[PDB]
Amino acid sequence: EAYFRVESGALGPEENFLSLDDILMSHEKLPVRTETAMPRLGAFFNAVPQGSKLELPLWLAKGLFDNKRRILSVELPKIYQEGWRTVFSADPNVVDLHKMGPHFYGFGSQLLHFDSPENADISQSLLQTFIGRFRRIMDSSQNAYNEDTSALVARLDEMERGLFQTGQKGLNDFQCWEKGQASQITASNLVQNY
Amino acid sequence: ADEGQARKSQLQRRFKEFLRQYRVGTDRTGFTFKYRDELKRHYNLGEYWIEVEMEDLASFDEDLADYLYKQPAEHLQLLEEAAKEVADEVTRPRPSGEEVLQDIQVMLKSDASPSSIRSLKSDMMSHLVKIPGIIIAASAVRAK
Amino acid sequence: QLYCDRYLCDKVVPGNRVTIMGIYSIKKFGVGVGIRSSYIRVLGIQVDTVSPQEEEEFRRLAA
Amino acid sequence: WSLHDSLCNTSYTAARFKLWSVHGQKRLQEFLADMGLPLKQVKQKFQAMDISLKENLREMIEQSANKFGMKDMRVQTFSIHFGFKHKFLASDVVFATMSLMESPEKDGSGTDHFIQALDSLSRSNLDKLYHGLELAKKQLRATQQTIASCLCTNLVISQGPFLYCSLMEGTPDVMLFSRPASLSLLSKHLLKSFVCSTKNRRCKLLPLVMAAPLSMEHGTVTVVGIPPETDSSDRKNFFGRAFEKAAESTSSRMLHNHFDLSVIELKAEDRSKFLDALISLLS
Amino acid sequence: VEGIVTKCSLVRPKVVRSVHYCPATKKTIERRYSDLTTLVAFPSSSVYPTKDEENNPLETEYGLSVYKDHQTITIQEMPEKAPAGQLPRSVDVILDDDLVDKAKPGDRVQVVGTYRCLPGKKGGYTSGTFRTVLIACNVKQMSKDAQPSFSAEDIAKIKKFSKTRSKDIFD
Amino acid sequence: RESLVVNYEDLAAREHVLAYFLPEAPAELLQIFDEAALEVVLAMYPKYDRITNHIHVRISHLPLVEELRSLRQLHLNQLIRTSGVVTSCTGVLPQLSMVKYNCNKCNFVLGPFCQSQNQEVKPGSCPECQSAGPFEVNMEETIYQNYQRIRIQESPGKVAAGRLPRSKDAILLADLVDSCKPGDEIELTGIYHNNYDGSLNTANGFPVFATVILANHVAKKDNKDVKMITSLSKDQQIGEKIFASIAPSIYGHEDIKRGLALALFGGEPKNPGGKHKVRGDINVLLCGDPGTAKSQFLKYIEKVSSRAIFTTGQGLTAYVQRHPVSREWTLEAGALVLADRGVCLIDEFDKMNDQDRTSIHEAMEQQSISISKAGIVTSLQARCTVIAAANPIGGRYDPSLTFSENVDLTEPIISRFDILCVVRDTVDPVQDEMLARF
Amino acid sequence: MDAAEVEFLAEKELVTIIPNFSLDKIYLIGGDLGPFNPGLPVEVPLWLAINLKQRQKCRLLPPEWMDVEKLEKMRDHERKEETFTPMPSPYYMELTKLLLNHASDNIPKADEIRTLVKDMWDTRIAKLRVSADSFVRQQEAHAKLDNLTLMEINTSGTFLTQALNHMYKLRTNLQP
DNA sequence: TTTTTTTTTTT
Ligand SMILES: Nc1ncnc2c1ncn2[C@@H]1O[C@H](COP(=O)(O)OP(=O)(O)O)[C@@H](O)[C@H]1O
Ligand SMILES: [Zn+2]
């Protein structure tokens, strides 16, 4: 109630520095093709050729990128390719955005700092998927009371679980006021140890 | 014949005032409308079924919960046609994609002592029974 | 013999314990001269009966 | 309860009908048949019994109990309604509270049950009352299975001026009556069943004295004393003096710990040393 | 629908039009047929008129009529997708019009067809129970079971490698 | 109970004229007696109307016990008393008793016709819209009654002297259903009623009618205070006195008498508190050369015990069977589920088949069978004590080898037996007289 | 916010009681009260009427808008109109909870007032999730809520605003 | 969808 973690800026211009969600977000891998040799460090993948397909975290490919593609170029995973961008248009209420994740909107908004050609078509997928999956999170979260919700929440990602936990915290708080139950003073964080 | 529908239009009105009025909880703590809220919370999720309890129906209006034990066939219909007229005045206006009112399968449970298969004498023909057992088979779903 | 319906279908699996509330009735598809068949039209059914923190008692024990 | 399980357990029709001897169990059957109560409705819970029977039940029962020698069958009490389904008789609250405070299984100090029973008297806690009615049932079905022991085995000794009994640990459901407060009711129902059972004319007017083991480690038992039973007993007990003077004479180890005097804890070895001096003292 | 084919039926014709002829009047009348396995679903009778008007006799002409093929297969749920507690469910498909022999027992197909219920009546009294079928209008074998789709780049590589060295290519 | 018994002999004593009218036209006297007993009971218990409002009077031991093969056409529609085993029973099906239809064009219910057990009832034309058509029943006002059909047949050795055993049908109505199971020995008492069948006429070529006994009273003939037993058990020496009470004829073997007596009463089937399910059944396995009254030890325990069954090893589990009467492919009980609490007497244990062997062992340490047969997947109960006797190989038990050799039995099976008695023999002069004389 | 502070803001509404004790004017930091003449009406803030009722020192009175007839017209007016219609008091839910729980015997026909209030509530909540779905569905940037009371706002606000922020972000991530 | 009898392939 007073532990206010630093929130995630993974949807705006640039992720926050201290947010433990973005730190684990950017760690996810991404495919690149190198433009030069990689001397003195070919141990991991001593030198590495130019024109080689490698898998690197996102944070690494932040500074190793330039406009001229001096060191390496990037190509998007298939989840954001043209293939799946039609699937997410058929009916977005069917996809398991936890397997295709578990950071869909967080990752996809950082792949816009690579000035690829099809950006005007990724920032339209996300917008049209989130709008598609809305009337199923506005209604399965404000209307699921004293139920086992661990199956209404099995196909969501970190940007959506944060909302499914705000619908419930406002349902279970009006239903606790209606029953004269939110008058008793209780232990706040000690019942967490118990 | 003409008194038939005139009784029904007076039962389908007393089965509707039960869902619309039955509460629980005391006066010290606070109350809770038990079946309107479940109708709404099951409709908005897209489930279309409530679970009426026979003790409640008995304690509200004593005659209805007796008809329901004697003539369950022709009274479950009135119950399920009042559940549909209450689920209409509770969830409306439905937002955009649905505007046709669905049909509410009213199940019902109870807390009463169970009979047994060996105690199904023919005088129990068309009376609510309550038997325990063990499922042994299962057909494949079909249309009807 | 039972007869389940819209939302009671695929609710129980062969091997379960249940408690049926049904309308004992007769088939009307119209050994003896006036014998009928009989079933129970079910309209109520019942059934009789990994973690994050659990992960750590594996972690520390492996460590 | 059901209408059947509450005739077999009230210690006022479980005495007259003699519902512990197969010879008189048919009396209950005849009583039920004389009213037109199907044996299948009487076995089911009362809230689910058909509506056509319960019209004048409380009169067709008082009548058909004259034909059997039970004329004090209607009493004067009160009842409360809260809401839609909440309907209590003033002698259900009592049997539920009295059994939340004296539950056998102990979960802490002596003042852990007291709190849970004080809780269940306000209307904001109908979930404890409605729970303390499943203990009060479990107790009443485990009392007629003890008064059925000491009357199909004749463990009521006629030790002279007073009857006498005792209990055995091996019998099931005898650790439930270990408390020194839930033992007085068992004895006071035992006397009521006995006085109706025996054929003598002397035993029918002698007070009872009962002992049951308290503590195996200290090796001690608990002892009570109840007035001579009758219909119009004045209810003026006299054992708080007898036990005192008897322990004084024998000079044994006793404890008058409670507030009432007629309940004592006694060494398992000073039983006879105490009892003989008491027999002589009451004379 | 996805899943395994576990039987097939015997391919049989099925009329969709007749062409009759009057040897007396030298005319030519036709007749259009339809059953419950169409998209329009009117049950026509296969009476094959022999005397439209009682005066003249008729005679069918099979060469000028129109028949079509008709099969009936049974898809069944994949084994590794069943909850393993039951006998996996099935469904009936009605292939047609040169979709016919496109599936043999033991395959993994993805039929794409309309879903339909077809009623009946034996003696003017119908049980409410119906039988539901799938009037397929496409079929796909899921597993690719061949490797002929070489790229022109691949055949280029191949004709290179086969020419590079004829001495040491076997070893 | 709505069923009153009227012993016939007293009816003949106190009444000279009715006890002669009765077995002549009993389809109406047994109807008048109903309305008499009703008005009597409703006077002795004026509220009994709330219990079934209808009384049937049975009749006990007519003086004319009869055979089942000597029923000729003289007895059509006459009260009759017979005897014999019952060999089938359908399930308790509900039959119409006071039917009541409803018209399809007027929403009016037709007259309450009664159902007679020879011909389907026929409603006329609607007296409200003259809409003569195919009416359907009205499940809410119709009255039903239980129904069951059994096939009785002559007792095995009683009358079937030098011929085959005949059989007959019987129809048990409301209160009687489930009064008897396949294998019971009963003695019917019922009108012997005939009815026309169109099939027999097409097989025999002559107008021939079928017959059936509308049973009116079923009284089984089978096998169904402590103050003595107190001191008799307190003899302190009841062991010797009981050992020589079983095996009443067969001399000797006070050794195996002990073990079998131990087995008969059993032991205690305690439930271990560690979820280990120890069993409380004593299983015995005799063995010994031929001619030593093993089979008699089995047959006498068939008698003395209760709810016992028997089998040879030359049917052990429930199997699909086409019912004789109902003509449905049902499931019938085997031979290890009919001893679900008593004993199972196996004979010729050696002659069991591989399926039989793999099925017998399962029930020893689990006492529970599963049947995923063509009928349906079930899991039933079987708690029986097994009493069997094997044979020695080579026509003689020879004690040079271990017993696990002369028995010819799979090794993990002998472990499933508690006692292993070995019957043996020897030429002994002093016992030759003892056994001969006996 | 949270319901237990809307309930705090709602205990400032004025109600009318009938005391049965003598007391002279009190000068509260939020006004004046009294004098309390036994058997004579006086108007006080709720948090005092409730607290005096619990101590058996008064007898409440039903507010005028709390009539079983005018309410049976509000309940129909609400279902006819297709926008949020004006309501008797900005805090009617909390009034008809606190009053009817603590003074249900001084209010005639409490268990019909209660059901009509709940009927109104169950509609004004249905209009919200339609007015909060067209917003997203059509990607608006403004929405005029007409006569929403603070309680309806607070029951589904901390979800709606939090799910519109994540939409503004997704809709303006391509400009730079 | 059951017995019983008779021929031929198969473990
Ligand atoms: N000691 C005995 N006392 C009485 N009868 C005996 C004795 N020994 C053998 N018999 C006779 O032998 C018969 C039993 O043979 P049985 O044990 O069944 O042979 P098998 O074991 O080869 O089947 C009995 O009918 C009985 O008459
Ligand atoms: Zn008609």
Domain range annotation of chain A: 20-175
Chain F closest CA to C53's CA: distance in Å?
29
Residue D202: both structure tokens together: 């002397």
User: A181 burial class (0-12, 13-18, 19+ CB within 10 angstroms)?
Assistant: exposed
SS3 D173: coil
Point out the residue nearest to H2 (C-alpha to C1'): F322
CATH number of the structural domain A20-175: 1.20.58.2050
Q: In this complex, which of A105, A142, A176 lies closest to G170 when CB atoms are compared? A: A105
- CB–CB of B122 and F107 under 8 A? no
Q: Which of B38, B39, B41, B47 to mutate to test the interface with A (most CBs of A within 10 A)?
A: B41
F370 annotated to a ligand binding site? no
Q: Where are the beta strands (DSSP E) in F343-413?
A: 343-347, 368-372, 377-381, 385-389
DSSP lists the bridge partners of residue D165 as D210
Cβ neighbours around D274 below 10 Å, total: 23
Q: Where are the beta strands (DSSP E) in D39-173?
A: 79-81, 87-89, 157-158, 163-166
Question: What is the C-alpha to C-alpha distance for residues E135 and E114, in angstroms, rounded to an integer?
Answer: 5
Question: What is the C-alpha to C-alpha distance for residues A123 and A113, in angstroms, rounded to an integer?
Answer: 12
Question: What is the C-alpha to C-alpha distance for residues D248 and D55, in angstroms, rounded to an integer?
Answer: 60
- Cα torsion F238, F240, F242, F243: sign: positive
Question: What is the C-alpha to C-alpha distance for residues F384 and B122, in angstroms, rounded to an integer?
Answer: 35
Residue F272: both structure tokens together: 């271990």
Residue A66: both structure tokens together: 């330039």
Q: Can you say how many angstroms the Cα of residue B73 is from the centroid of all Cα atoms in its chain?
A: 12
Residue B42: both structure tokens together: 């099951």
Helix (H), strand (E) at residue D221: strand D220-226
CA angle E23, E25, E27 (to 5 degrees): 85
Question: What is the C-alpha to C-alpha distance for residues F416 and F284, in angstroms, rounded to an integer?
Answer: 9
Å from the F315 CA to the H9 C1': 30
Å from the E7 CA to the H8 C1': 30
Of F292, F312, F349, the residue with max ligand 1 atoms within 8 A of its CB, to mutate for a pocket test, comes to F292
Going by DSSP bridges, is the β-strand pair F95-98/F284-286 parallel, antiparallel, or unpaired?
unpaired
Closest alpha carbon to A106 in A20, A26, A6 = A26
Residue F152: both structure tokens together: 């009785």
Question: What is the C-alpha to C-alpha distance for residues A176 and A166, in angstroms, rounded to an integer?
Answer: 15
DSSP D228: P
Helix (H), strand (E) at residue F167: strand F167-172
Q: Is the peptide bond before A102 cis (omega within 30 degrees of 0)?
A: yes
Å from the F321 CA to the H2 C1': 8
Backbone angles phi, psi at F85, to 5 degrees: -70, 150
Going by DSSP bridges, is the β-strand pair D157-158/F190-196 parallel, antiparallel, or unpaired?
unpaired
Question: What is the C-alpha to C-alpha distance for residues A28 and A49, in angstroms, rounded to an integer?
Answer: 24
Q: Can you say how many angstroms the Cα of residue C44 is from the centroid of all Cα atoms in its chain?
A: 10
Chain F closest CA to C12's CA: distance in Å?
15
Sequence-separated contacts (24+) of D105-112 with Cβ below 8 Å: none
CB pairs under 8 A between B and C: 77
- Edge to edge, the sheet with strand F190-196 lists F185-186, F84-89, F148-153, F167-172, F209-215, F190-196
Q: Cα–Cα distances in Å, from D219 out to D56, D104, D222?
A: 54, 20, 11
Q: What is the DSSP string of D158-169?
A: E-SSSEEEE--T
Question: What is the C-alpha to C-alpha distance for residues G77 and G70, in angstroms, rounded to an integer?
Answer: 10
- F48 neighbourhood in chain D, CB within 8 Å: 36
Q: Is the shortest CB-to-strand distance from F315 to strand H under 7 Å? A: no
Q: Which other chains touch chain G, taking contact as 3+ CB pairs less than 8 Å apart?
A: A, B
Residue B107 near residue B50 (C-beta atoms within 8 A):
yes
Question: What is the C-alpha to C-alpha distance for residues F250 and F264, in angstroms, rounded to an integer?
Answer: 18
Start-end of H helices in F72-225: 200-204
Question: What is the C-alpha to C-alpha distance for residues F3 and F34, in angstroms, rounded to an integer?
Answer: 10
DSSP F173: -
Contacts of A137 (CB under 8 A, 6+ apart): A156, A160, A163, A164, A167, G163
Question: What is the C-alpha to C-alpha distance for residues D274 and E99, in angstroms, rounded to an integer?
Answer: 105
Helix F294-304, helix F254-265: angle, nearest 10: 30
Residue G136 near residue A132 (C-beta atoms within 8 A):
no
Question: What is the C-alpha to C-alpha distance for residues F54 and F171, in angstroms, rounded to an integer?
Answer: 19
Q: Which atom of ligand 1 is nearest to the CA of F288?
A: 21
Q: In this complex, which of G114, G123, G133 lies closest to B95 when CB atoms are compared? A: G133
- C38 neighbourhood in chain F, CB within 8 Å: 93-94
Chain B closest CA to G122's CA: distance in Å?
6
Going by DSSP bridges, is the β-strand pair F4-7/F57-60 parallel, antiparallel, or unpaired?
parallel
C near G: at least 3 beta-carbon pairs less than 8 Å apart: no
- F50 neighbourhood in chain D, CB within 8 Å: 36, 38
Q: Is the shortest CB-to-strand distance from F322 to strand H under 7 Å? A: yes
Nearest CA to ligand 1 atom 24: F293
- C28 neighbourhood in chain F, CB within 8 Å: 136-137, 139
SS3 D272: helix
Cβ neighbours around E126 below 10 Å, total: 11
Q: Is the shortest CB-to-strand distance from F329 to strand H under 7 Å? A: yes
Question: What is the C-alpha to C-alpha distance for residues B18 and G80, in angstroms, rounded to an integer?
Answer: 24
Cβ neighbours around A35 below 10 Å, total: 16
DSSP lists the bridge partners of residue F149 as F171
**Pocket flag, ligand 1, residue F80 (CB < 6 Å):** no
Closest alpha carbon to F296 in F222, F385, F389 = F389
Residue D209 near residue D222 (C-beta atoms within 8 A):
no
CB half-sphere exposure, B116, CA atoms < 13 A = 2
SS3 F186: strand
Say which amino acid occupies E38. T
Helix (H), strand (E) at residue A177: helix A158-178
Our CA dihedral for F301, F306, F311, F312, rounded to 10 degrees, sits at -10
With an 8 Å Cβ cutoff, is A180 touching chain B?
A: yes
Residue E46: both structure tokens together: 């296969």
SS3 G156: coil
Residue B83 near residue B36 (C-beta atoms within 8 A):
no
Question: What is the C-alpha to C-alpha distance for residues D222 and D212, in angstroms, rounded to an integer?
Answer: 5
Cβ neighbours around F419 below 10 Å, total: 16
- CB–CB of B92 and G129 under 8 A? no
Question: What is the C-alpha to C-alpha distance for residues B75 and B52, in angstroms, rounded to an integer?
Answer: 14
Residue in chain E closest to B138 (alpha carbons) equals E86
Question: What is the C-alpha to C-alpha distance for residues G150 and G156, in angstroms, rounded to an integer?
Answer: 11
Residue D163: both structure tokens together: 């009857």
Sequence-separated contacts (24+) of A94-98 with Cβ below 8 Å: A95/A155, A96/A155, A97/A155, A97/A156, A97/A157, A97/A160, A98/A154, A98/A155, A98/A156, A98/A157
Distance F292 CA to ligand 1 centre (A): 5
Residue A142: both structure tokens together: 């404000």
- CB–CB of E85 and C29 under 8 A? no
- CB–CB of A144 and B41 under 8 A? yes
Question: What is the C-alpha to C-alpha distance for residues D119 and D129, in angstroms, rounded to an integer?
Answer: 9
- CB–CB of B122 and F139 under 8 A? no
Residue F146 near residue F173 (C-beta atoms within 8 A):
yes
Distance E125 CA to ligand 2 centre (A): 19
User: D225 burial class (0-12, 13-18, 19+ CB within 10 angstroms)?
Assistant: buried
F295 annotated to a ligand binding site? yes
Q: Where are the beta strands (DSSP E) in chain E?
A: 2-5, 14-19, 30-32, 66-68, 73-76, 90-93, 109-110, 113-118, 131-136
Helix (H), strand (E) at residue F95: strand F95-98
Distance F112 CA to ligand 2 centre (A): 15
Question: What is the C-alpha to C-alpha distance for residues F42 and D170, in angstroms, rounded to an integer?
Answer: 50
Residue A48 near residue A34 (C-beta atoms within 8 A):
yes
Contacts of D270 (CB under 8 A, 6+ apart): D250, D252, D253, D254
Q: Cα–Cα distances in Å, from F206 out to F105, F196, F203, F209, F358?
A: 44, 12, 8, 10, 53
Residue D211 near residue D263 (C-beta atoms within 8 A):
no
DSSP C47: B
| Max intra-chain CA distance, chain D | 66
Residue D107 near residue D84 (C-beta atoms within 8 A):
no
SS3 C18: strand
Helix G46-54, helix G92-102: angle, nearest 10: 10
Domains of chain G by range and CATH? 1-66 (3.40.5.50), 67-176 (no CATH)
Phi-psi group of D168: left, alpha or beta (phi > 0 → left; psi -120 to 50 → alpha; rest → beta): beta
Residue A194: both structure tokens together: 């118990």
Q: Count Cβ neighbours within 10 Å for each residue of A143-178 and write b for 16 or more, e otherwise.
A: bbeeeeeeebbebbbbbbebbbebbbebbebbbbbb
Closest alpha carbon to F152 in F178, F171, F174 = F171
Residue D217: both structure tokens together: 């480690």
Chain A closest CA to G133's CA: distance in Å?
7
Contacts of F427 (CB under 8 A, 6+ apart): none
- CB–CB of C13 and E127 under 8 A? no
Q: Is the shortest CB-to-strand distance from F324 to strand H under 7 Å? A: no
- Cα torsion F35, F38, F43, F46: sign: negative
SS3 A53: strand
